[PDB]
Structures are given as structure tokens and as C-alpha cells.
Amino acid sequence: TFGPVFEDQPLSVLFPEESTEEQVLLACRARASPPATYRWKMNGTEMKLEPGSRHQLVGGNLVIMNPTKAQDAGVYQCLASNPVGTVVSREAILRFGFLQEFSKEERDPVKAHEGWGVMLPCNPPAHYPGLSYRWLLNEFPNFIPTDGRHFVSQTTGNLYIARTNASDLGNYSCLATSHMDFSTKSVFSKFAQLNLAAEDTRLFAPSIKARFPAETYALVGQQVTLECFAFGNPVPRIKWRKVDGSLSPQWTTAEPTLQIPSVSFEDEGTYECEAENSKGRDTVQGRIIVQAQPEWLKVISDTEADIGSNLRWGCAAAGKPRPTVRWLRNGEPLASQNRVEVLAGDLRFSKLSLEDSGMYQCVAENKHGTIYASAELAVQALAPDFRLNPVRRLIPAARGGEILIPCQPRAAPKAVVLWSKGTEILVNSSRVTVTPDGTLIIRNISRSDEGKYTCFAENFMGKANSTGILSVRDATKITLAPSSADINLGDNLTLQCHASHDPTMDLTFTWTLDDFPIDFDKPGGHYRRTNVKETIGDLTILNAQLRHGGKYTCMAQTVVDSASKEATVLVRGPPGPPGGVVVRDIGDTTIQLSWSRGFDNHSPIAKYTLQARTPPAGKWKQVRTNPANIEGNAETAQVLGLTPWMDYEFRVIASNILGTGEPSGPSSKIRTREAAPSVAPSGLSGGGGAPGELIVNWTPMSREYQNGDGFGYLLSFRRQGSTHWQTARVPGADAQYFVYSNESVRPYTPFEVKIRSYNRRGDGPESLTALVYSAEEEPRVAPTKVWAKGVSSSEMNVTWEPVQQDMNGILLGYEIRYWKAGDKEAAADRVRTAGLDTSARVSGLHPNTKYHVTVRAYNRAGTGPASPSANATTMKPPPRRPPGNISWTFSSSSLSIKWDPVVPFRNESAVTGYKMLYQNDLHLTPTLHLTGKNWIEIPVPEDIGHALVQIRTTGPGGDGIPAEVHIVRN
Amino acid sequence: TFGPVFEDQPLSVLFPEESTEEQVLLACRARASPPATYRWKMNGTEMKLEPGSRHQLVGGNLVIMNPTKAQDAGVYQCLASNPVGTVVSREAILRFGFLQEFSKEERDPVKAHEGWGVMLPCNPPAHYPGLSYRWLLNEFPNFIPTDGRHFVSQTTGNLYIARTNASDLGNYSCLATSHMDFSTKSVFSKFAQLNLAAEDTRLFAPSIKARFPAETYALVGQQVTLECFAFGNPVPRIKWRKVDGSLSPQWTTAEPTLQIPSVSFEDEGTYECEAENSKGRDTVQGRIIVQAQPEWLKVISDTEADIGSNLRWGCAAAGKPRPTVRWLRNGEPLASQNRVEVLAGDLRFSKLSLEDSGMYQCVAENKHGTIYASAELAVQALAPDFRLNPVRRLIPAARGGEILIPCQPRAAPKAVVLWSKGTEILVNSSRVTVTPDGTLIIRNISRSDEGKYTCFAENFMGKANSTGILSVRDATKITLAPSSADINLGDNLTLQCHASHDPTMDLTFTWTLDDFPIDFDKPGGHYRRTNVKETIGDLTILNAQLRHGGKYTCMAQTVVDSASKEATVLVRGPPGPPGGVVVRDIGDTTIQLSWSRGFDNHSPIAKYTLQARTPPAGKWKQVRTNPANIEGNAETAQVLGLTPWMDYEFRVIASNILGTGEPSGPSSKIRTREAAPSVAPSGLSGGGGAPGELIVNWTPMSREYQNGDGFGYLLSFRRQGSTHWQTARVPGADAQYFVYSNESVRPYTPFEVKIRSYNRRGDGPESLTALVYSAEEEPRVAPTKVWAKGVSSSEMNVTWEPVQQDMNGILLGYEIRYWKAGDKEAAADRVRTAGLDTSARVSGLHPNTKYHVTVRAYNRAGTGPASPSANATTMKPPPRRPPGNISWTFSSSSLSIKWDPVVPFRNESAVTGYKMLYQNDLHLTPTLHLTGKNWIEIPVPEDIGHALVQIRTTGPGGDGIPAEVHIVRN
Ligand SMILES: *[C@@H]1O[C@H](CO)[C@@H](O[C@@H]2O[C@H](CO)[C@@H](O)[C@H](O)[C@H]2NC(C)=O)[C@H](O)[C@H]1NC(C)=O
Ligand SMILES: *[C@@H]1O[C@H](CO)[C@@H](O[C@@H]2O[C@H](CO)[C@@H](O)[C@H](O)[C@H]2NC(C)=O)[C@H](O)[C@H]1NC(C)=O
Ligand SMILES: *[C@@H]1O[C@H](CO)[C@@H](O[C@@H]2O[C@H](CO)[C@@H](O)[C@H](O)[C@H]2NC(C)=O)[C@H](O)[C@H]1NC(C)=O
Ligand SMILES: *[C@@H]1O[C@H](CO)[C@@H](O)[C@H](O)[C@H]1NC(C)=O
Predict the structure, then answer these.
(1) How far is ligand 3, taken at its centre, from the CA of residue B435, in Å?
(2) Which residues pair with B710 in a beta bridge?
(3) Helix, coil or strand: residue B546
(4) DSSP character string of A368-388
(5) Helix (H, G, I), strand (E, B), or coil: what is residue A550?
(6) Which cysteines are joined by disulfide bonds (chains A, B)?
(7) Which of these, B88, B21, B75, lies nearest to B45 by C-alpha position?
(8) Does the beta carbon of B17 lie under 8 angstroms from any beta carbon of chain A?
(9) Terminal-to-terminal C-alpha distance of chain B
(10) Alpha helices by DSSP H, B668-826
(11) Helix (H, G, I), strand (E, B) or coil at A118
(12) A805 and chain B in contact, CB less than 8 A
């Protein structure tokens, strides 16, 4: 069974006077089981719906035959009643559409001045709803024309004419037109005669007589038309504006009837109409305040509740002005009662009972409407039933421990729990406690307390019992707790956790660190197990680091019971990271660094070491401070020893006795702000290069040697003994040379050079001061008295005089150019001497060839001109014939080889000696022997069977073509 | 309907051979609806329970008529079947009690040596259960005697004599005695002849032949009897002990059958029997392992579950050895399947179906028993019903926001949710999201989504729908967020929170600080509200202190939505308390303090001040520290300027720009370690006191000035010009005097004194060095030539000579003792002089009285002896008579009074002058005038009409009694 919820509710109807329908159907039907009897209210009094009267109840719907205004106007309200409860439908305000005949008094004629406006009232009769107005210039259907001169009001119905003349006279009357659901009716008014006085020929101010009202209250969605009609001479314009904002541009008109099609909450504000002509102005202000019909936000639903519970029914509604939410119970109003609290808002039941069952209604209300929301409260009384939440049937307990056994059945209301051990009914005492929600508490469990525990349940509906079996075991306790420990990094540490338990059961050890479980199977695994038995749970931390410090909880558990002990391990006293490296006090080579502190678990910080780099070019090398060991309580120390014009990043390392710690993040890229150079140019050399010019050369210097901005070289050069110093000022790094030449500077001139650097703010220090000379030129003095003589077939000797010193500088050597007989100078071979010698030897020549020799002189700059020539002829070639009649005699340790001397031909040279290569069986390499005559002796030992003898000639002709003689000993 | 759960279960029966009952009755009945069919199993296969056979099913209970060993001995098991499921009862091991007849083989006679022990076997037959053995020395009922020589075994039953002789011979026989449930049977064995050899007359070792076994496996509650019987000459003692502990003393016997009535788990261990006599010893070892039947811990219950859900039934048991928990479904074994997972432990269903409904049994098993636990799984297929968790019937939304509409009915299985906007069905797109669990997600909601949303639900069971109204409202947003702020203590601060919302609803502001709600109504309230409108919700913190800083969260809420912004306020950068102040480096006046850091939020710590007290005597004053302001990075400064011996507690104060901070907890009660005094005793004085003795008096000198331990005073005293110094050494502070007197020291002797202090380790500094004298004594020289003369009636003058200097010291004055004529020295009046005068005046005397005058001399010590006496007589009294014949004459400004002179009597003195007092009308006080004759002139002005004149006499006799004259002018 359920209470009545509506499917259709009664609507407000507009019944016309000229209706073709004799009945009014106010529809109401609510679904129900059993189907409801339906009562109707009229103005708070109940309608006696007798059969055969004019107010019949046809199917629930109220049918009213032939209504008139003094009998059936009012408010109507459907009440659906079953014996669950009574609900109230929303109110149907039955309004009568009627149009009365016009006012039959003899109205006065209207007198006004010509040239002004005129004011004729309509005086409309009593009506519903709001009429539409036009007037009549004559009989029907001759209306007033619609223009900018005649203005018809839809609020008061009067026609407003701005300026009148004598063509506007006519048969003036009012007219009304109403459009309704079943009929259309219009009715003519009384005759109005208008008379005009003499003409006031002036130009004057506008006078707005049609006033749009001061607080126009609109609902959301109502069409609102404001009116601002003006008198005056001449014709005024009408402007509409918004004072506190701007008009929305979907309906902006320059018309005296401003029409909004749908008024919403953004159109609320202060409005202004302005009339203005050529001679005056008039301003009229007003307001539109937008209100709302109530709509629901949070309503109530059909809740199933137990007897005795706390039920809070919140119910809220939104609308403008904000709705007084009130409550109905079963068609009657519900105030605050003995168990019922209404805060005009939530409905809070203190203790529920079975007389609170019924249809309750949330009603919201303001002056624009009244809305309703129904719910059923079904208060239920139940038997206790243990099929959803019973007592635990087969129960563990420990010896010396605690047991929480609840007995909470699905009972409405809260059942009387009387515990029993078998047949013995348990009473509260010093050991056994029956808490009156149902929970039995037994302290100090032994083996006399095991048994068959039955929880009884009782309310007025019925009874049930649920029976649990208590078994007493041994208690799991830790016999050897893990103690606190203090280690280092890299140490191994076990934590002892033995346990003792009942030997029927099983015992697992779970170790938790800071209430997170231990992952034994991590890659790079640290935690491992030692000494496996059943009841030994020793975790051994292997290669302990900083994340293994914290609280340890060895939980020995069975499936029924758990016991835990506490251990606290602290691993390293960490030389940790400092944070926020702040660079202060920026100087030339002096810079201030400040940092944060580290950590002090085992030990406080012993020292701070300081590091720097030039990023990204340079790396981390240790820089110097004063004091040279930074003391460990100092968060700031100042650092020296810097080389400027590089960017820098600074980090700091904390240290302890447990190892030098990992460093911090470096600081910001701080800029050096120098004012001085201090590094001299190195690698200074001078002299040489171009002839006649002073060229000084030196090394390039990179970024660590230059110091600062505006870098270049100051090379200072002057003549030895001169009183004038010349200074070169060239910027850049690539200019590693300077050339000075002048018309008064000759070759071999001594100069004094030194070099320093410069920057934007100073001059550099001095280099090595040395005396250099200007470079020499190529010579012009030829060699004299060149005489040549051949000494062999491939060598000749060329001699020349030691010549005088040239004007172009320093002579260093001589150059020999030579070519054959009949050849030229362009195919010559050029052989230079190693020094200033008066003679040299031309070697590598052909035999019997005449040569032409020219001697030139050279130095470092170039080669001078040629000498007068000399001629020489090489010696004859050696003879290609072998020596004849070769004989040999052996001995016990020697071999003597004799031969005839060589007689040459006419084109061959003489032989003054012989050379011989000798190879035997015991050696793989030949040996050289020399002689001056035609016989020789060589040692041959007794193991040699045969030998290889090659005989060639030597002398002034050169080495000849050798023979090859094979000598067998036996 | 429900499956079968058992009420009675089949017990294992022991059916004897001599039973009076022709049947066995293994009972099995389970409660059911529809009622269960009971099948039976025997040796792993089913019993064909035909009617009319020997295996009848009477009511579910199996009745077997006339059982024998080869036909019906086995394992019986009841199966209760309904079409919910099938359960299996636990096994009834039907074992038979039987006693077979004895061995009919011709057994051999037992032969051993006399003087030894002998073992006669029983050879017991096949039997069940465990027999009780007694024996036969003769025919029945002549048994063996029970003593400490015949030993009765229960495991093997053989005969054990410790020492035999020839009186133990006879026709030996075994016997057995079994006690059963329905019968008692005892049968007789074969005859045994005992023959013995010649006697081995020796004393030898014990020999335990009857050995208690190597692992005796006991259950919990079984009675265990071990056996240790020994041979030997003489008869040995039998001791039982536990090897790994001690025996429990409730059953300790010095008997060869160790008897435990109930073996529990504390008897598990190794056991030891020791046989020992006068000539040898024997030891044997064994063990008792206590095992257990399985009992349950966590079982399974009757669970209704939805189709398609995940279900985990855990099931665990306790017992030794630990039970292989396996599963039965419907009387058949249940392995791991496609949806059913068995881990031999918990049972996991992946996806349920309707074919998984049935009775499931959980079976625990070892070698000591098998236990069962039944449960029902009822897989429910349900229609979707929205009567318990519907769709929200009236849904509010924000424009531009977000809504989640869940559709989760009570449906088995998970229903198909297909949302609709009325009749238009909803497809997933980029704006509307229909999730497969049922939640409809609409982002960026405008007023085209306002509608009548219907959730649909579909499975194979049925169709249901629930319908919700979506209304589209404007979003609550914050137009002016609260910004972060930086203040001081004592500054006022307003956090702006303007909101914007639709005008139908109401807008409340909840301000939460660090997710705790702000209490405006605290005593000493700081948070107040400013500038009240509807949508303006700014909070103003007034007198803001240090707990008002943190995360502020302004939450504008309606009842349908919320909007929150964050503001962070920092209030003061505190000079907080430093914690754990540590005193190091304990010296004399130098002491080292180290403390912790504070806070640096606004500003860091500018300075540290150090204060101290001496508790409970001294208070908090600022002590001096080098350096004179402690810098803000310094946690350690050295503090000086202390006064020693005293206990101290040192407190530290941090300070900054924002005020002098709250001071810390002070340190420990630290004690300095001084060894030097530096304060001389002040206020030094000498002289006076006792006569003839040198007494030095000075100020007692308190414990803030005394410095070190072992305190006392060194007073150094010597004679002026003496070469010997005397030094006093008195400890204690109350001795403020020292007396030196000697036989060679006379009065008026000069002395030189100075004082210093001492302690345990040194001497104090010098005081003021002054020359004092020894104190004088009382004199002995009398005054000489005392002469007296009266000068008036009340005065006389006593003169004496200036006497010489006494031997007792210094004279300072004189003392006059005087009494009347006839009186004595004991009632005399004593008048002392103020110095060394030669004359003094005794005044205050009576007229006409003779006096006796004695003059003594005095000083500071005492008064010396008397002089020779002198006598003097005072003169006559003044006359008491008034002056007669008083006449007066007035003038313009004066009054002259004349009188006769006074003629005295013979006992009265003469009158040489007059004194008078005058009082008039204009003055309230009298005025005194003097005259030397018998007339006087007084000034009387003209306004005085009455005068008061009193006239008395004066002279050498004294002032007389006045008269009283009243003078009237007119
Ligand atoms: C029920 O209530 C309505 C409203 O109070 C009554 O209607 C009014 O009747 C008088 C006289 O006929 C009119 O002047 C009012 O203008 C009516 N007001 C409205 C809002 O219609 C009605 O008469 C009451 N019914 C009865 C039977 O008295
Ligand atoms: C056993 O102990 C409980 C707890 O001490 C008792 O419960 C209290 O009963 C009174 C009266 O109903 C309540 O006002 C208390 O609040 C209860 N205490 C708690 C903690 O719930 C209980 O009454 C005792 N049983 C008997 C039979 O006396
Ligand atoms: C509407 O959106 C949801 C969420 O994106 C879609 O649900 C997913 O469907 C597939 C196929 O069943 C699942 O594998 C995913 O896990 C689902 N996502 C989530 C978050 O649960 C849904 O299919 C979409 N609707 C339609 C009609 O396409
Ligand atoms: C214990 O620690 C040391 C140092 O870390 C290590 O060398 C050693 O191998 C560790 N012991 C074991 C058993 O791993």
C-alpha cells in the first residue's frame, strides 16, 4: 500500500461571460492503492459534493454546472485521501473573465488651450484580464490614426495627443478590446466632446503626463511595456536608457512604448525616459524589479524508517521574495510538537512511533505562488531476524585477552539483549560486561569461559536467538621485542622478533615501516631474512641507507590475533644538501656566499668545502676562502682567489665523520664586475719576417688570461737611444702582430720592445724586456773570383772569395746554381751552403760532363745576384771490364786471392784500389774488406765448403761494376 | 527454501562381539524445506538402501541388522539432498570390539640364569580396543602379586622381574581384560613353565628391556602411560625427568609407570628414564609429540550474492599437523574451474552465475580427524527497482558548470543504462557522456539542457525507469577573490570576498582556516564582520596575532553549489622560544651558553639578550656578555660578569624589528666552581664594650658577598710598634666579634687592626686599616674639695676640683648623687653631667630642705667611688598672699595698674619683682609682660571693655601663687 501522489493537479481557468461551455472541469487524479476518496475545498471550507447538486464529483474531477460571479468565484483545492494519508493539491484560482458595460454618467466636456496638449480620460470599466485599447474618431470602425501625434496608453487607456489644432476635432469616444479563450468582445463608450480655447502661441517645455510607475514588479517571462508620452510645442523625441548599465540591444527602440518580450533577472534596474525638444527637456525615472515564482531545489522522498530513529527531512526552495517553507501533515498544518520539530526548514523527528505514519507535505509560499511536495513516511516495526547480521557462529578468543562480541539484529525498535552461556543467564559483574546496545565484553579469558553463547533478542514484535561457540586459544605475544638501534651507512643490522603462539595455529610475521609494508623483492634489494624457523621473524637490513630509518613494527599475526612491538632505527647523521645558495656583495675578486644548514642526527657538521666552475666551459675544482677550514656553525663565508671575467656557479658541501656528503644545487650565474688587469703577455719574440720591417710576434691568450672588457695589446717600441716612445693601441684577440716601417728606419736597426695589455679600466703589467733588431733584406753583392776544379768523376770543388758586408744587412750563406754544358739557368739544380764557408763541394754528378757554375749569396729574406761564371770538367768513368786470370790458394785458416791489374781503355779512368764483398756458408750477410794492391787475405774457417766473392774497383774514378766469383774449397 | 544444515551427525560406534543389541543406529537428520533425502556411503561407494534388506533407512537413520566383520565394518557417511544442494556428514568409523582366543601353538619354556631377571612373553591376540593386562601365577583367580619386583606392562604385556629366586616358580599364564560398552570379557592363555639355570652370584648393571617408545604421538586429552622396567642385581631405582625442562608436579611419581591424566601442549618434549643401583647405571631417551584434532577458526556462512559479483569465502582451521583445507560442492569435490578458484584456502568466484547456487562444504583434514562446515550460496537474479536508490528526482545545475547524474538501481546483474531527454535518446558526443556504470555527464550546461531526464534500465529480468527534472540556474562564482596579505601583530586586516549569484537563492559564506571552521563567538574575539549586504562577505581580523596565519578559504555557498578561493596570510615573523638551552664549560666566573635558533618569516633575529636569576632568591636582571650585542646568526656566546657560589638558570630572548620576544624555558640549576674571594668585610669599627679588652665590631656579611666554601674571617691584630702579628681564624658568619685580652695588655693601649676573609682556597682582600684603642675601665679616683651653695629655693650649685688622670683610663664626666636630710644613699636621685665640667647645678628641688651631696666620677665602663660629703640648704618658699590695694587708671590707649608691695612672713622669702599675664576680649590667649617694680603699663585699645589680669611674684624665692583681677573699663 502507498499514499497518494498526483499525476494531474488542478489548473487555473479563465471562464468567459459569453461561454459556450456550461461546465468547469478542474482535473485531479492521484495514483493510489487502495484508490482514494477525493474532497474539494473552496476558500478554506469543504465542498459538500452531494449527488444531484450543481457541484458533482465525477471520477475525482470536480464539475461545476453553470457558474456565476457571486456563487463560484474563489480558490479550489483537491484533497486525495486513502488511509495512508491525505495530500493537498495546488490551488486553482478560478478567475472570471467578464466585460461590463460602460459608465453611463454624463461626462464633462474637455476644455484646454489650443497649441497645447489635450487630456481626455477613457474611464474604463471593471474587467479581467488586461484590456487592449484603441479609440474612435467617428463611429465604428473609424478609429484614431496610429502615428507620432496620437499615443494610446495600454495601462490607463487614455489617448495622449501632444499638440492639437482644428483638424483634430471629431466624434471622440473610448473603446476596449479583449481577447479571451472562448469569446471576443468589444463595447463602445460614452460620447466625449472636446472644446478648445484661444491659441497660446508659444514654444515651451515638454510635460510628460504618462508616467511609467515607480516600482514595476515583473515575473520572469512577463511581457513588460512602459509608457512615456509627452506634451509640448515643438514635437519632442523620446529616448529610453538604463541608469545603472546599458540596454540590451535585441529590443532597443526609439519609440514611446518600450517593449521587452521576455523580462529576466539581468533586466532588473533603474530606467529613465527623456523627452527633449528645441526649447526644453524633461526627465522621468523609474524601476523594474524582477521577481520569481517559486521552484523547488531539494524535496523530500518516500523514506522507509524504523521506529525510534532520527529522521531529518531537509526541504528547500528558491524564489524571489524568498519563500517561507512550511509543513503539512495529512492535510492539516504541522507545528513543533513533542516528537516533531519544524524550524520552517528541516523536519527533525526526535523519536519515531507508529502514529507518525502518513503523508507529509513540504509547502513553499510567497506572494507570487504556492508550490507543494509530497512524501510518505512509512514507520516500520520489525521482528528481530539474524539472517543479515548475526552473531559470529564459531569464535576465537585468546587467553588473557579481550573479546568484542556484538549482537545487532535487524530489529525495529532496539531489542532487549540478554546474553546467556548455555542456560546460565549472564549478569554484569567485575569480569563480564553486557553493554545495552548488545555487545558482550569479557575480560581475562580462561578455559572455564568457553561454551555455547546464545544472544537473546526481544521487542514487542517477536523474539530470536543466535548462538556462537567460544573457543579459547593461547595468546600470540612477542617474547623478544625489537630494540632501538643506532648504525651507520653501509652497516648490516638485524632486528630480533621472536613470538610464541598456540601450536595448532600458524604464525606469519609482517614488518611495516612507517605504516607502509616492506617490499622484500625490490631491484637493488636491501631487506633479507635470517635464521628461518616457524616463530622467528628477524629482518636483517643489508647495506642500510638513509631511507631505512624510521619506525619499525614487527606484527606477528595468526588469522585470529595480532601483537606488535616497536623499534626505532636512525641510520646516518647526514651531511645533507644545503638549500638556496644566495650570492651577495659583488666585487672585483671578492664575493660573499650564504647558504642554509644541513642535518644533525648523529653528529653536527664538521666543515664546509666550497666549489666553483665557469659554465659550461670549466669544471668543479675547489676554491679558497679565509678561514681555510670553514667552521660548521657558519651559514656564510666569504671566498677569494678568483680569476675574473668569467661567469660562475657556486655550490657548497657539508661534511661529517660518516663520509663527505653529496653536494647541493649550484647558485645563479653571477657576473664579475672587475676594474683591473694583472696578467702580462707571454711568449714574446721579435725579428724576422718581412724585410726591412719590425715585426713583433706573440702567443694568443684565451679567456682565462685576458681579464675584462675592451681587451687589446699595448706594444711599446722605440729605437735604442731614442727619446720618443711609440705606442700601438689595437683591440681584439686575433691581432698577434704589429708591423712598423718608416723611411728613416734602415735594416739592421736595434729596437727596444715591451708589451702590456689594456682593458676598459687600466693597463696591464710588463712582459720580458728584450732588445730586438730589424729584419735584413736580400743581398746585392755578388761573389768574386770563382774558381772550380774537378776532384773525381762525380765531385768538384767550387771556391770563392769572402766578400764584404752588404748595405742590406747580414749575409748568412751561399747558393750554388749549376747546369750542364749547353744548358740554361732555368733547369739548374740549386745547392745551398749551411754557413759562411769559402768553399763547397758539388756532388751527385755524371762522369765526363762539363758544368757551368754560378755562385749566389743568400740570407733569410732572399737570394742575391749571380757571380761571373766558372767552368769545370768531371773525370772519366770507371772500367766495366772484370779483372782477369783470378787464382786462389787455400790454407788451414785463410784464403789468398790474387788477380791481374785492370788495364783500362781510352774512355775509362785508372784503378788505384779494390773493394770486395765476401759471403760464406756460415753467414747470411756479406762482409766488406778493403785492399790497396792486387792481392788480399781473408779468414776462412774449416767448416766452410764454398764461398761467394765479388770483386769491384775503387779510386778517383769511382766504384766500378763488380764481378762474381764462386770458389769451391774441395 | 533452504539447503540442509545438520542437527545430528553420525557418531562412531564400538559394537562388541558379545552385544545384546542386534542393530547399529547411525543417526543423521538435517533440517530442510523441502525435506531432505538421506543417502549413505560405505567404503567410497553408495549403499543400495532397498526396503526389506539388511540395510534399511528408517527415517533417514541407517539401521543395519546383525553386523559382522567381513560384511559391515567400514566408514559410513550421510548425504542429505534437497534440490537446493547436497551436504555430506562427517564419517562414522564403525569399528568392532572383539577378543579372539589365544595362541594354541606349543610355546617354548623360558630359560635364563638364576640371580638375573627373566622375560616371559604373553603373545597377545588380535583385539580392539587397547587391553588391560593382568596375569596368572596359578589358576583363576590367583594372580601375580603387585610390588616393586613384578612389573606390569600395558603396551607389550610381557613379564618383567628385577631379581628372581626359586620361590617365584609356578604354572605361569597370561590373561587379558577388556571393558566395553555392553560386555566384559576375560579369557585365559596357555601354560608357561619357568626353568632356571645355575646361579650367577654377581652384582651387576641394570638393563632396561621395557622401553618407552621413540616418538609417542599423543592427542590433546589422551591419557599416556610410559613404561621403564629394569633387570639387575640389586633392584634398581627408576627416575623420570624432562630433558629440556622440568616435570609438572601434579603427577610426579617415583614409579616405573609415569602417568599423565590429560596430555596438553606443555608436555611436548623429550623424556628420560634412568635406572640406577649400587653397582651401575642405565639411561634411555624418548619423546612425546602432542598432536591435535582439527577445530575451526573462521568458517563460511549462508551468503546471498548478486549474479556477476566477486565473492571471497575464507575458511581456515587449527590443528596439529596443519590441515589441508579442501572444498566440496554438492557432495562432489571442487577443484579450480573456469569461474571457481580454489587455492586450498579461500574460495574465489570471478563471475557468478545461476548454476553456482548450491551447498558448499569446507573440509579440513589431517591424520587425526576430518571436520566439515556447510554454507549456502544463493545467487539471486533480480529485477531493477528504484525504491531504494533512485535517480535524483529534482536535479539542480550551474550554468557553465558540471553535473553527474548516477543511475544505480538494485539490479542483478549490472543493467544497461540508456539515458533520454524525454523521448530524444542520448548518444555520447563531445558534450554529453553516458558512462557504462550509469553516470550521465553534461559539461557546459546552458538552458537548452533544462528538461525531463529519464534513466532507463534493462536486463533479462525486467524494465524500470526513474525520472529526474534538471533545472538550470546561474553559477555561484567569486567576483573579487581574497588576495594574500602581509601584516604585523596588532594590525587590522580585511579579506574581501564578493560573490555573484542568481537572486532566487540564498548565499551564505563559510570561512575556513586550514580546513577548520572559524569560531566568531570565542571569548576574546578577533574575527568580526564588516559592510553587511547579501553578497558581500568580507572577514575582518581585529588585533591579529600569530594563530591567525595560514590558508584562508572563503566559501560562498548556496544549497546547490559552492565556490572557494585561497588567501595566504603571514602575520608576524616571530622571535620565538629557542628550545633546549645547554650550559657548557663550567669555570669560576666564566660560563658558556649554547641554544637553538628561532624563526625568520618576516624578518630574522636581530639580537640576543641574556638574563639570569638565583632561584628562588634572585630575579630576572640582564647580565653582561662579550660581545656587547649578540649577533643574530650566533647560537653561542660566552657570558661573563657573574658573582660566584650561587645556583643559576639562564634564559635567552630573541629579538627583531617587530618587538622583544617571548623568553624561553631556562636551563638546569647549574653550579659554578670558584676558588677565590674578592670582597673585604665592610663597616669596620673598634673600641668600647667590655673594660680592658679589645673588641672589634663590624657588619655580618651575607651569602651573595661571601664567595667560596669554608668561609670565615681573618682578623689581624697587633700592638702599635710590635713585631709580632696575631691572626684569628674563626669559621662561620654569625661570629661578629673577637675578644683579645692578656696579662701584659693594660687599658688605653693602642692597637693596629685590619680584617680579611678566607675560604677553602685563599684569603680575602684588605679592609680599612685603622688604629683603635683598648677600652677603659671604671675609675677609682674620688672628687676632692666638694663645696656647695644654694642659689635659690629649688637650685644649688655643687663645685669640685679637677682631679688627676686615673690608672684605669679616661675620665669623661661626673655623677651627682643627692638625698635629703636624714635619708640614705639607696633612695638617692642620680644626675650625671654632659662632660668634664668643674661645676654642675642640681635642680628640681623643694624649698627649705637640707640636702647631702656626694659626687662620683664616671665613664663608658662604670661609675667610681664617692667623695667626702657636702651639705647645703635651699631657701624659703615664695609668699602665698596676694598683693593688696590694687588700683587702676585708664587712658586713651593704655592702662596702668598699681599695687602695694608684699610683706612676707617669717617662713616666706622676699619679693624682688613681678610677672603678670594679661588677657582681653579681643584675644583668646594670654600675653606675658615683665616688670621690676610695683607698677606696669599695658596697651589697651578702645574696643576692649573687659580685661583679665593675673599678678604673681618672682625673684630668688621662685614664682608664687597668682591672684586674679577682673577689670571693667566702663
Ligand atoms: C472566495 O474568495 C474570493 C477571494 O477572496 C471571493 O472573491 C471576491 O468577491 C468579491 C465580491 O463578489 C469581489 O469584489 C472580489 O473582487 C473577489 N475577489 C477575487 C480575487 O475574486 C469569493 O467571493 C469567495 N467566495 C464566496 C462564496 O464568498
Ligand atoms: C553492564 O555495564 C554497562 C556499562 O558499564 C552498563 O551500561 C550502562 O547503563 C546505564 C543505564 O542504562 C546507561 O546510562 C549507561 O550509559 C551504560 N553505559 C555504557 C558504557 O553504555 C550496564 O547497565 C551493566 N549491566 C547491568 C545489568 O547493570
Ligand atoms: C561514452 O563515454 C564512455 C567513457 O569515455 C565510454 O565508456 C568506455 O567504453 C569502453 C568499451 O566498453 C570501455 O573499454 C571503457 O573503459 C569505457 N570508459 C570508461 C571511462 O569507463 C562509452 O562507451 C561512450 N559511449 C558510447 C555510446 O560510445
Ligand atoms: C656486512 O657489512 C660489510 C660492510 O658494509 C660488508 O662488507 C659485509 O659483506 C656485510 N656482511 C654480509 C654477510 O653481507
Answers:
(1) 6
(2) none
(3) helix
(4) S-EEEEEEEEEEE-B----SS
(5) strand
(6) 28-78, 122-174, 228-273, 315-362
(7) B75
(8) no
(9) 149
(10) none
(11) strand
(12) no
Structural contact between residues A838 and A816, judged by C-beta atoms closer than 8 angstroms = no
CA of A426 to the centre of ligand 2 (A): 14
Q: What is the resolution of this structure in A?
A: 3.5
What is the C-alpha to C-alpha distance for residues B202 and A52, in angstroms, rounded to an integer? 139
What are the cell numbers at A466?
543466535
* Cα–Cα separations (whole angstroms), residue B720 to B749, B775, B777, B807: 9, 15, 21, 20
φ/ψ of B397, rounded to 5, equals -140, 160
DSSP assignments along B391-411, one per residue? --SEEEEETTSEEEE----S-
- Residue-level length of chain B: 970
Q: Are A560 and A505 in contact (CB under 8 A)?
A: yes
Q: Cis peptide leading into A616, omega within 30 of 0?
A: yes
Which DSSP helix (H) or strand (E) runs through B341?
strand B340-342
Task: Kindly list the residues from chain B whose CB atom is less than 8 angstroms away from the CB atom of residue A296.
Answer: 394
* Contacts of residue B474, Cβ cutoff 8 Å, sequence gap at least 6: A265, B398, B399, B501, B502
Q: Which domains does chain A have, with CATH numbers?
A: 2-96 (2.60.40.10), 295-380 (2.60.40.10), 394-473 (2.60.40.10), 477-570 (2.60.40.10), 582-660 (2.60.40.10), 685-772 (2.60.40.10), 787-873 (2.60.40.10), 887-968 (2.60.40.10)
Pocket test for ligand 3, best of B420, B429, B434, B439 (most atoms within 8 A of CB): B434
The whole-angstrom separation of Cα A266 and Cα A680 is 82
The ligand placed nearest to the CA atom of residue A440 is 2
Cβ count near A163 (within 10 Å): 17
Could you tell me which of A112, A110, A111, A113 has the C-alpha nearest to residue A202? A113
- B/e letters for A70-86, b = 16+ CB within 10 Å, e = fewer, are eebeeebbbbbbbebbb
Which residues, in sequence order, are bridge partners of residue B873?
Answer: B850
The answer to whether the beta carbons of residues B593 and B551 sit under 8 Å apart is no
Strand order in the sheet with A539-541: A493-495, A539-541, A527-529
Q: What nine digits make up the cell of B343?
A: 587455492
The residue of A2, A220, A288, A297 whose CB has the most chain B CBs within 10 angstroms, and thus the best one to mutate to test that interface, is A297
Label each residue of B1-49 as H, E or C: CEEEEEEECCCCCEEECCCCCCEEEECCEEEEECCCEEEEEECCEECCC
Cβ-Cβ contacts under 8 Å for B383 (sequence gap 6 or more): B411, B459, B461, B462, B464
Written as nine digits, the cell of B144 is 601375580
The grid coordinates of residue B330 equal 554438492
- Grouping H, G, I as helix, E, B as strand and the rest as coil, residue A354 is helix
**Residue B807 gets which letter from DSSP?**
S
Of A747, A770, A755, A772, nearest to A693 by C-alpha is A747
d(CA A644, CA A675): 10
| Residue owning grid cell 669623661 | B812
* DSSP annotation of B132: B
**Joined grid coordinates for residue A569:** 632505527
Angle at B677 between CA B675 and CA B683, to 5 degrees: 160
* Residue from the list A387, A473, A559 with its beta carbon closest to the beta carbon of B316: A559
Place of cell 762482409: A927
Q: Do A122 and A134 form a contact (C-beta atoms < 8 A)?
A: no
The experimental technique behind this entry is cryo-EM
Among residues 842-871 of chain B, which lie with CB inside 8 Å of chain A? none
Cα(A243)–Cα(A248) distance, rounded to whole angstroms?
Answer: 13
Gap from CA of A45 to ligand 1 centroid (Å): 14
**CA pair distance B846, A428, nearest whole angstrom:** 107
Read off the C-alpha cell for B326. Answer: 579442501
CA distance linking residue A689 with residue A540, whole number of Å: 80
C-alpha B136/C-alpha B414 separation (Å) is: 83
Dist CA B279 CA B320 (whole Å):
44
Please, are residues B445 and B404 in contact by the beta-carbon 8 Å criterion? no
Do you know the residue count of chain A?
970
